Structures are given as C-alpha cells and as structure tokens.
Amino acid sequence: KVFGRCELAAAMKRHGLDNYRGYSLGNWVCAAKFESNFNTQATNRNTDGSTDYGILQINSRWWCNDGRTPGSRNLCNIPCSALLSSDITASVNCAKKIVSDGNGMNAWVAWRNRCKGTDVQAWIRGCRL
Numbered sequence: 001k002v003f004g005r006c007e008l009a010a011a012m013k014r015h016g017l018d019n020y021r022g023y024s025l026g027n028w029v030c031a032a033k034f035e036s037n038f039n040t041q042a043t044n045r046n047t048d049g050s051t052d053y054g055i056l057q058i059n060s061r062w063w064c065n066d067g068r069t070p071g072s073r074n075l076c077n078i079p080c081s082a083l084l085s086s087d088i089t090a091s092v093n094c095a096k097k098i099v100s101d102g103n104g105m106n107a108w109v110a111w112r113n114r115c116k117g118t119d120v121q122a123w124i125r126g127c128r129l
C-alpha cells in the first residue's frame, strides 16, 4: 500500500511513534518518505547481500529473517515479508527496537541525510492528528 502523508502520520501516532525516544512524528514521516516513498511493499538490495524492506527499509542482516542473508540475525523475530504488509504494525514494533539500540534515528541513512536538522514539522502540517 502506498500511504498518503497524513494517513501515515495518523497510523504512526496510533502505534505510539510520536515522541518515541524523543523523536517527534515528523521525524518518522520524513524518514518513511525518503526510505520508501510511503510504499509498504518497497525492497532494495544491498552490496553485502542484504536487503532493506518496507516503509522504513529495515535491513535483513540484523532485524529480520529473509532466508538468504548468511550469518545474519533476526533481532525483531519476524520474517522480513511481514514488513511489507499494508498493516504497518510489525514495522513500527521493529523500528522501536532499532531506534532504541544506541544511534537513535541515525540507523536510517535517509533520515540522517535528508531529515536531520530540518523543519520536520512540515511533514505533519495540515493533518488532523
């Protein structure tokens, strides 16, 4: 599913991301925009053989099992295909583990390069939250 901007904000807010680990909702929306363009089914392959999955582009080396990533961990205890659902719950739950792990939202290179230090409140302006 391809979310609208305010639709995804609302969904993220109901799953408890606003201000999670001190990261306001506009941070998450901004990171989803550039990681995937709001498209749950998104995937992208990395040089090291891993793949990034879903709205938040979560990586199979550490966080999910795809069966084709050697030696990798599955710290979220889920198959990577669960991250492609129209129901973003599974991705949100996994992202809460990522952002708590020590580097905060710097785990998302699109966030670091395109959202960090910007007026990320823009991303939820206009929305009925």
Ligand code: NA
Binding pocket: 060, 061, 062, 063, 064, 065, 066, 069, 072, 073, 074
């Ligand atoms: Na894995």
